[PDB]
Amino acid sequence: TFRTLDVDSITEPVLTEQDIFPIRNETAEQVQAAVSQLIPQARSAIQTGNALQGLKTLLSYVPYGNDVQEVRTQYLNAFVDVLSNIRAADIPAFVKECSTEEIDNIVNFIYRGLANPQAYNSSVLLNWHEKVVEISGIGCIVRVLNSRPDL
Amino acid sequence: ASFNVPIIMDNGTGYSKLGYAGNDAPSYVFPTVIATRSRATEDLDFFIGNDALKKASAGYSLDYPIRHGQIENWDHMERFWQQSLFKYLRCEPEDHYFLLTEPPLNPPENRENTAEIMFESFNCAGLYIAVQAVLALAASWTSSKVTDRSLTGTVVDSGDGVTHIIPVAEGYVIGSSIKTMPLAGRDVTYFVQSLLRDRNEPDSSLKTAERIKEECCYVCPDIVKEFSRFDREPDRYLKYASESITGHSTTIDVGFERFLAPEIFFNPEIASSDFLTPLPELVDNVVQSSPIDVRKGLYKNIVLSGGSTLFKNFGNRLQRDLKRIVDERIHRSEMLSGAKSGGVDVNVISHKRQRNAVWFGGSLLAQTPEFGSYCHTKADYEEYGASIARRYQIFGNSL
Amino acid sequence: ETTALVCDNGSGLVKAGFAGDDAPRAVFPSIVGRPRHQGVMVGMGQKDSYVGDEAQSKRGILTLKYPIEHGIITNWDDMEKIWHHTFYNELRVAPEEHPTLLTEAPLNPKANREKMTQIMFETFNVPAMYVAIQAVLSLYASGRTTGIVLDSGDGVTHNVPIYEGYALPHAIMRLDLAGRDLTDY
Amino acid sequence: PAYHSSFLSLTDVPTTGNIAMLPLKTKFRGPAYPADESQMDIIDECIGLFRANCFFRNFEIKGPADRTLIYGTLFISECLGRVNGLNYRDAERQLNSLALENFSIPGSAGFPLNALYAPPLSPQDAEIMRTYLTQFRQELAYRLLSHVYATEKDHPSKWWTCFSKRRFMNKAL
Amino acid sequence: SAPIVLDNGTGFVKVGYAKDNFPRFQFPSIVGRPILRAEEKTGNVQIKDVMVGDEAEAVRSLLQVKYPMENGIIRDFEEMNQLWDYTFFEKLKIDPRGRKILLTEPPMNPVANREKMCETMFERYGFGGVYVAIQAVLSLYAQGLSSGVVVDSGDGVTHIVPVYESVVLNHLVGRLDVAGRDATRYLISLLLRKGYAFNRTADFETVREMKEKLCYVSYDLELDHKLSEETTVLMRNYTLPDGRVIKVGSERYECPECLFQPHLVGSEQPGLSEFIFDTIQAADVDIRKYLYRAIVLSGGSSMYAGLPSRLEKEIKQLWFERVLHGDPARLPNFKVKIEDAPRRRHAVFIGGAVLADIMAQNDHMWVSKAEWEEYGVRALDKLGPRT
Amino acid sequence: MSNTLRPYLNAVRSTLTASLALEEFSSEIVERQSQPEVEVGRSPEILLKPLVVSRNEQEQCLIESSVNSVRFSIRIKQVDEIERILVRKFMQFLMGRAESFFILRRKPVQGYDISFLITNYHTEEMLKHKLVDFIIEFMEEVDAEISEMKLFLNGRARLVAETYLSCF
Amino acid sequence: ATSQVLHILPKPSYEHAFNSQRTEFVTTTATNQVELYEQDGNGWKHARTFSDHDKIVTCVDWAPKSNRIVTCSQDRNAYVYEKRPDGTWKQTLVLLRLNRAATFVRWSPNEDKFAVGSGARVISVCYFEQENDWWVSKHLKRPLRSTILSLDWHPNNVLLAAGCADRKAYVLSAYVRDVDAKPEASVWGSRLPFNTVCAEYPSGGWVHAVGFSPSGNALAYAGHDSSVTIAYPSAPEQPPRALITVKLSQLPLRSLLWANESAIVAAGYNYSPILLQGNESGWAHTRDLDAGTSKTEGPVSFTALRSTFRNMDLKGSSQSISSLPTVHQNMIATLRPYAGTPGNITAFTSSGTDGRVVLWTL
Ligand SMILES: Nc1ncnc2c1ncn2[C@@H]1O[C@H](COP(=O)(O)OP(=O)(O)OP(=O)(O)O)[C@@H](O)[C@H]1O
Ligand SMILES: Nc1ncnc2c1ncn2[C@@H]1O[C@H](COP(=O)(O)OP(=O)(O)O)[C@@H](O)[C@H]1O
Ligand SMILES: Nc1ncnc2c1ncn2[C@@H]1O[C@H](COP(=O)(O)OP(=O)(O)O)[C@@H](O)[C@H]1O
Ligand SMILES: [Mg+2]
Numbered sequence A: 001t002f003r004t005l006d007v008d009s010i011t012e013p014v015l016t017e018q019d020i021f022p023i024r025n026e027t028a029e030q031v032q033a034a035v036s037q038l039i040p041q042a043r044s045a046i047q048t049g050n051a052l053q054g055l056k057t058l059l060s061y062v063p064y065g066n067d068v069q070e071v072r073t074q075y076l077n078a079f080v081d082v083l084s085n086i087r088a089a090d091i092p093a094f095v096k097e098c099s100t101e102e103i104d105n106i107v108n109f110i111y112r113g114l115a116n117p118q119a120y121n122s123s124v125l126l127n128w129h130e131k132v133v134e135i136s137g138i139g140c141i142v143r144v145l146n147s148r149p150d151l
Numbered sequence B: 001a002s003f004n005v006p007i008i009m010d011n012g013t014g015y016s017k018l019g020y021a022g023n024d025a026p027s028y029v030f031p032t033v034i035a036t037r038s039r040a041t042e043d044l045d046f047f048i049g050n051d052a053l054k055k056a057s058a059g060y061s062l063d064y065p066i067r068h069g070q071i072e073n074w075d076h077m078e079r080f081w082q083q084s085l086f087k088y089l090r091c092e093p094e095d096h097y098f099l100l101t102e103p104p105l106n107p108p109e110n111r112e113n114t115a116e117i118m119f120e121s122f123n124c125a126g127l128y129i130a131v132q133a134v135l136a137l138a139a140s141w142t143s144s145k146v147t148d149r150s151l152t153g154t155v156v157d158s159g160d161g162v163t164h165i166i167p168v169a170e171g172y173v174i175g176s177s178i179k180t181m182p183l184a185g186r187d188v189t190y191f192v193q194s195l196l197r198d199r200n201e202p203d204s205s206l207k208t209a210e211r212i213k214e215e216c217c218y219v220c221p222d223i224v225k226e227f228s229r230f231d232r233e234p235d236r237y238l239k240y241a242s243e244s245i246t247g248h249s250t251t252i253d254v255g256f257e258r259f260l261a262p263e264i265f266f267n268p269e270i271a272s273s274d275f276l277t278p279l280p281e282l283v284d285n286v287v288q289s290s291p292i293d294v295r296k297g298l299y300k301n302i303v304l305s306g307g308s309t310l311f312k313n314f315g316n317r318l319q320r321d322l323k324r325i326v327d328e329r330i331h332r333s334e335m336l337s338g339a340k341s342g343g344v345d346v347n348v349i350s351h352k353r354q355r356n357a358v359w360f361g362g363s364l365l366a367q368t369p370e371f372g373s374y375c376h377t378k379a380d381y382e383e384y385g386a387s388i389a390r391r392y393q394i395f396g397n398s399l
Numbered sequence C: 001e002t003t004a005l006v007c008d009n010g011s012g013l014v015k016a017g018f019a020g021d022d023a024p025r026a027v028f029p030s031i032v033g034r035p036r037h038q039g040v041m042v043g044m045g046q047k048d049s050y051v052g053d054e055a056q057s058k059r060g061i062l063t064l065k066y067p068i069e070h071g072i073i074t075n076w077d078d079m080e081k082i083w084h085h086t087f088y089n090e091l092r093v094a095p096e097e098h099p100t101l102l103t104e105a106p107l108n109p110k111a112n113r114e115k116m117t118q119i120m121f122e123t124f125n126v127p128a129m130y131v132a133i134q135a136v137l138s139l140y141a142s143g144r145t146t147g148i149v150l151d152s153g154d155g156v157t158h159n160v161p162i163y164e165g166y167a168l169p170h171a172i173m174r175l176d177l178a179g180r181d182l183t184d185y
Numbered sequence D: 001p002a003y004h005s006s007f008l009s010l011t012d013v014p015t016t017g018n019i020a021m022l023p024l025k026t027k028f029r030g031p032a033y034p035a036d037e038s039q040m041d042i043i044d045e046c047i048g049l050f051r052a053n054c055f056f057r058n059f060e061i062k063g064p065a066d067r068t069l070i071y072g073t074l075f076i077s078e079c080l081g082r083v084n085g086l087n088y089r090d091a092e093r094q095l096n097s098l099a100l101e102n103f104s105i106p107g108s109a110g111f112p113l114n115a116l117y118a119p120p121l122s123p124q125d126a127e128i129m130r131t132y133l134t135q136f137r138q139e140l141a142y143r144l145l146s147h148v149y150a151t152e153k154d155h156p157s158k159w160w161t162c163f164s165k166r167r168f169m170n171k172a173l
Numbered sequence E: 001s002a003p004i005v006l007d008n009g010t011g012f013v014k015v016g017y018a019k020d021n022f023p024r025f026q027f028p029s030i031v032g033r034p035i036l037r038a039e040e041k042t043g044n045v046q047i048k049d050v051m052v053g054d055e056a057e058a059v060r061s062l063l064q065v066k067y068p069m070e071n072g073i074i075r076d077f078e079e080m081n082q083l084w085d086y087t088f089f090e091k092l093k094i095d096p097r098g099r100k101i102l103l104t105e106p107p108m109n110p111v112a113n114r115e116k117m118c119e120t121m122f123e124r125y126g127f128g129g130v131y132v133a134i135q136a137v138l139s140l141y142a143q144g145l146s147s148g149v150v151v152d153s154g155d156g157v158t159h160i161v162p163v164y165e166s167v168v169l170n171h172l173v174g175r176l177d178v179a180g181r182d183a184t185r186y187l188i189s190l191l192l193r194k195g196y197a198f199n200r201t202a203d204f205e206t207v208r209e210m211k212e213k214l215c216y217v218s219y220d221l222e223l224d225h226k227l228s229e230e231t232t233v234l235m236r237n238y239t240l241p242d243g244r245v246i247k248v249g250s251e252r253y254e255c256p257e258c259l260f261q262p263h264l265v266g267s268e269q270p271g272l273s274e275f276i277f278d279t280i281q282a283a284d285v286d287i288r289k290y291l292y293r294a295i296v297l298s299g300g301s302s303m304y305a306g307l308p309s310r311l312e313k314e315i316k317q318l319w320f321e322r323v324l325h326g327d328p329a330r331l332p333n334f335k336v337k338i339e340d341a342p343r344r345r346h347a348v349f350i351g352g353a354v355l356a357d358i359m360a361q362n363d364h365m366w367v368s369k370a371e372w373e374e375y376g377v378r379a380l381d382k383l384g385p386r387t
Numbered sequence F: 001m002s003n004t005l006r007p008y009l010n011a012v013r014s015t016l017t018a019s020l021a022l023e024e025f026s027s028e029i030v031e032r033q034s035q036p037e038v039e040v041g042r043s044p045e046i047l048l049k050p051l052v053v054s055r056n057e058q059e060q061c062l063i064e065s066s067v068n069s070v071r072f073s074i075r076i077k078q079v080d081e082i083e084r085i086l087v088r089k090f091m092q093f094l095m096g097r098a099e100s101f102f103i104l105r106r107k108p109v110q111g112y113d114i115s116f117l118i119t120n121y122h123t124e125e126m127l128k129h130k131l132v133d134f135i136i137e138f139m140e141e142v143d144a145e146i147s148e149m150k151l152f153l154n155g156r157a158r159l160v161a162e163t164y165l166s167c168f
Numbered sequence G: 001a002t003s004q005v006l007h008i009l010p011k012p013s014y015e016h017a018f019n020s021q022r023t024e025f026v027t028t029t030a031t032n033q034v035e036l037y038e039q040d041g042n043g044w045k046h047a048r049t050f051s052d053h054d055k056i057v058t059c060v061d062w063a064p065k066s067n068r069i070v071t072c073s074q075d076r077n078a079y080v081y082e083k084r085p086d087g088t089w090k091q092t093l094v095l096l097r098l099n100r101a102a103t104f105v106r107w108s109p110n111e112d113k114f115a116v117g118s119g120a121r122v123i124s125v126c127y128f129e130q131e132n133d134w135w136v137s138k139h140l141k142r143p144l145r146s147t148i149l150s151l152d153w154h155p156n157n158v159l160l161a162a163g164c165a166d167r168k169a170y171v172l173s174a175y176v177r178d179v180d181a182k183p184e185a186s187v188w189g190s191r192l193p194f195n196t197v198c199a200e201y202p203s204g205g206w207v208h209a210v211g212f213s214p215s216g217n218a219l220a221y222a223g224h225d226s227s228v229t230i231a232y233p234s235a236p237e238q239p240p241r242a243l244i245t246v247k248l249s250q251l252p253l254r255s256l257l258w259a260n261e262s263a264i265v266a267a268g269y270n271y272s273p274i275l276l277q278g279n280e281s282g283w284a285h286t287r288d289l290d291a292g293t294s295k296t297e298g299p300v301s302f303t304a305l306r307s308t309f310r311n312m313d314l315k316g317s318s319q320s321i322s323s324l325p326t327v328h329q330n331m332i333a334t335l336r337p338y339a340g341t342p343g344n345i346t347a348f349t350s351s352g353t354d355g356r357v358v359l360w361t362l
């Protein structure tokens, strides 16, 4: 009886995720508009056979947050399509011509794309993951392990 | 609607006693051993029981699945169950309810494995697990018509692999008082075989030792006086006829074993150093650790069980020792205080169903209509998983 | 880890020791020799039989006789005495505390092996024991898996050809000529 | 396991080291004070109780009389291991020869039970212990020979020598 | 010179003098009679007639051990006399006649035990002073606190006593008949679950050391059942001093559970936390904070890993369930602080050592030999008129 | 086996070897005690984000890490219900002997069929550069076993059918 | 560089410490015991053990000036050891008053006081009162939020760098009256009362280690994201001039040691130490000091043959087991100086879970 009904959850409020990572200064409408502006540029770049430039442009800004679920899903769908619309033979040059933070975003989002395979194509994500881990190293996956949960 | 008759399983260390509820005797009482090799595939070339015993030198190697009451190897146990069910018992598992029994103090892992084998390999309608004892208390009372149930006493279940002293008070079993000695008919059988070994008898087969117990051994008051009586009295020197395989009229001259073997129960130091408390003293400790109000009921009714309590003068000696110890304690209290008392009597009880009291109690219990509600239904297993029977209930309190 | 006695009761020597040792720590001739003189001298606790190195040292007035004949045991009482000596006076370990590992020549009589295990169980009360073959153990010691092993001890000479793992039982050739016959010649 | 010498309750009994100088009846020569001829002496009770003591594996000592009983049990085991398969006269010859042998005593390196038996205090104590043990085991062997051939002459009874392989306490002389 | 202090605990014996900090000598209260069993029995040095103390616990293989004290009282007294003789004659090897000794005793012992212990101490030793004090007040002295309730859990019996501002509430002293010995017995049973059997006498000390090294108190029952039901991380390997290894699983967190759930060992009495709560609640309304605000653990049996946290959480939870009736509004207005000093095992000894020179230099505070002999057993009332 | 599972297998390998940077850490809520932090989940400041690796909808690799303990549960292919029953029974037998495996859980997390749990001590004493080797080796060999055992089922069914029918 | 393996401990060692004369060194193990070792010619041999504690020993540090050893363990108690004139050592408990297990301890450069990290939300700083022969602890609980994972003193003897497990690096002033005099004005600050928030810096993971530069005007900390950040303070309540962050491609770093005024050596789960060369402008990984990808007719002995059969029987390969290239076999514990004047270090030791104590010769 009295063994159940735990009380430790209220007397000492445990640290909650916003206490660990910096809070998002941008507003929901601002980031939503920014993503809604970035995505069609990526789609158009895919249409004109310049998928590398489209991915580079889409990689410049990356949204996050617990209140931006829908726009994050649209961003992820666009990113998955852009990456799947890239020839495989040109990957190493792209990977080598990036900064560490950009590669971190790439690996983070491809790994999140791996989490939902009932709607995506896993083969291209796995191939990209293999090549980026081969070239950049394991530090990218380390950063993935130590990234924000909302990312 | 009208269900089929429940089936009473029993898997002892030495003997397994199958049967049905409502029967007046087990259908099969055969040793718990399976023969196995090492154009029928090696999956099926196995024999159990008396067939295995006869087919021993034809190309099979016997093995006992159960030792000390706990099952070690699982292939042997599952093959034993399937052979029994589909060969001797002749029942379809999906249309019957089973009442398995297994000794207390077993790991919950063993019960989980038994339940999952029964509900997956066979998937019977329902499985109920009872403690070897209990059934002993149920079968204790003979003229059980409507009312004359003791429902309070002690059951000394001594068998082939392990013996258990379990007190019961008003039905419920007091866990904190449960104690078990790891010596039984098999250990004293090994002792008898060693005694035949030292005398260099022409035959020393284990079956010969078992039969030597079957028609020779008896309990004695004390060992030195019995040795003196054996020295003086010359007609206590028997020669058992063996006829092992081809040694016709190779009589085995038995000796002091006839009284040295049963004394292990009342003197466990001989068997090994793993235990050193004599059985009457251990029973006294069990009764004393019990709550104060039920001690009279525990002492008044003591029920023997198992096939290893059939020794002559076993009950007499046990009752004498317990009565002496309780008198010693009561008199010590009396001279400490200085007042008389009415005292407590002890009645060790033996009945006509000593050998298979567990099976008879199970058969009597299964016939009750309320027994069906207590079984583990297959829907419960498929819903709550294979760990439905892991919470050990009779001895100790969970969590 | 689980030390076991390794007793190789060869026809000329009894090599013994624990499992895992680099070399056996108990090697001595398999000889039981009783005195053959009246011995009018009194005192000094003259024993009635001497086994092993003591027998070899006192062989001046001892009637030495091997208890084994071409790998086959013929002096079971003498062999029990030798086994008792090996367990107690040379290894100084209780038999009922460690298992043993015996060897016997191929194509040996079955009663020999049956009585060997019967004695080692009934008498010394050993926990467990195994009866291997000399050629298999020689293959073990050679660090190989295939090849035909030529084994020639004091008692008998035998070849057991063994391919990868498998041993052919129809190609075992046993020849009784051995070191004792060479000594007689 | 509760079997013990009935003379552990004796008072004012002399002792050497931690072994009691209990009375003994014998035709041999030694320091033991002769006991009553109608009583149940240490050697007779030790012989009678050996056939039940050799089967236990847990013994708790209560005094020097228990040490004497243990020594007697060890000697009985040794004799039963030696007297096997012999005649009567040959049995007495061999047992007397082995008993008279210069054996090991408490306080010496060769004694297996040196932990429980204290060394003698003085050389005179050592010598009196020497003669006590010699007399004790001589009479014990004589009594055992008298008892074991109670029915025949040319062979030991196999019932009494089946205990030869029994290794009492796994520690003996 | 300085007065001697003795703490004859059920499972251990501690002794020292005034102004001391750590016990001078500690050793189990065991008596070893010689015995020969199926062992090798190497003659290390010698086996004497009666071996007690450190020598007994070291040579325990070749001797049987009997515990003179059970449930906080002395069962057989000759062995305990041998124990005092050992402690006074070789542990400290100083045995003057006329020195001052301060004894200890759990609260609700029989009068006969204390009376005849004092009689033995007077007649057989001839000491010129005596004083018997409760372990609880000594535990209170250990931290120097004045007001607060202190719980003492030892080998024999666990007791709790509330004291408020230098006034001992003699009518609210506690006595819970579950201690380290019951936990050890339950551990032996729980090992008998798997198959290991410890029926010898040295095996009792072996499993006591096992529980010392491995067993721990749970903090959340359901979490640990889940851990032991799905994960094998809880398995530990322990090698016996004989050299044999066994497997221990749920026994680690199920052994000391009997302290909090005494129904496991067949005890009708309430658990540790429930009994503490009842004892505190039975007191007057004024002192209830200072009873809650200062709870001091003491004794060897309180050294269980994770015991203070479980005790604090459980007492807060039980207060929430019993007083607030499920309302979480007033929970943050409760102050409970369980004290967990590192030497709560020897708090009794420390308190005795402090009291040794607190009340020294004035023999007219305790009983003397002449006063004892001319006022009989009834002279033993100057100590304290406790209930 | 391989020549077939390159990208999925290498992704699992890399993620596992990156997630095995464990450390000794006590309990932040209970004193003088240390517990696997991935299983309790009471202190979120030391729990790395859960990570999932997949190749197809029926194959997943949930990788949950922490400061001291890592739990790694996978799903294996079950194309037809024969393989479903075979996988369930086989993986039950696999987890039934977790005592001798040291990196197994007796019960997998819901929605899966197996869950490894590498506590610190395993990396402390057992060299961990082949724990992952065993992981990938098992992830391919398990499908191998399921196929082989269904072949054996077909074979035994054929044998018993022939044995029954020939004795008319 | 060049490395020599000093000894092969049978069990993992999370810490080590050498005396001032570099004659004998103390190390910890998995259990509650603390091990001592002394030179035996060209090698080392066991010296003695300490069983005073009850639970797992966490950290041990040796004071070189006074030749004293402190030990903080999981049992929430601290022991201080000083050798007796005869040769033995005298134990001394320190009442830390902690509520959870201690994690890391360090002696001040003046060895007058030592601070103790803990998982009880707090840090305990202890000094010695000669008037009472007591050790008293003070709790630092104002800015702290999570478990302490590392400690680092300052040459001014007052500032204390605390590496917390809340992804934030902490610097606090541990100055106490009656022990330390007033410290000089510092770039970190001048007004330094006890328990003041000197600075706070973020990170991408748990701050495994922190470290002040030999000049004492900088901080270097490493998170769990395999990134080492070098901080350059400017003024109190003033953002640092430059926060240089170098991100690596290996396993996360564990401990940081300052090779000189402009060099940092740090090692972690990569089984190797690294070196950082740079200045205020920036930093970059310089060299892999562990040789990188080194990948380093006869009778067979009985032991080797038995090993081959055991591998064949228990296995299906019977091949070489590991042949790992790196000198260490598991994660490294810490890096400590071995010899050389401050700012001039050429030798530094290290310990790891494999038990190897590998000296590194720059
Ligand atoms: N760290 C520990 N973990 C578990 N149990 C412990 C620990 N330390 C001590 N104990 C237990 O405490 C007991 C020792 O208690 P102690 O002897 O001090 O009590 P006592 O003085 O006998 O009590 P009393 O005064 O009531 O007789 C031991 O039996 C031991 O089992
Ligand atoms: N008449 C008898 N007297 C003594 N012991 C017997 C007798 N009959 C059988 N036994 C032994 O007692 C054991 C107990 O019988 P039983 O209860 O059927 O065995 P189990 O304990 O294995 O269930 C038998 O297995 C046998 O070894
Ligand atoms: N160096 C040697 N030179 C010649 N003959 C030897 C040599 N070593 C041993 N022998 C012979 O080998 C015999 C011993 O063989 P052994 O290894 O004991 O075989 P087994 O163990 O099967 O009896 C002895 O009779 C001896 O004559
Ligand atoms: Mg039975």
Ligand SMILES: [Mg+2]
Binding pocket: C010, C011, C134, C151, C152, C153, C154
């Ligand atoms: Mg040979």
Ligand SMILES: [Mg+2]
Binding pocket: E009, E135, E154, E299, E348
């Ligand atoms: Mg106490």
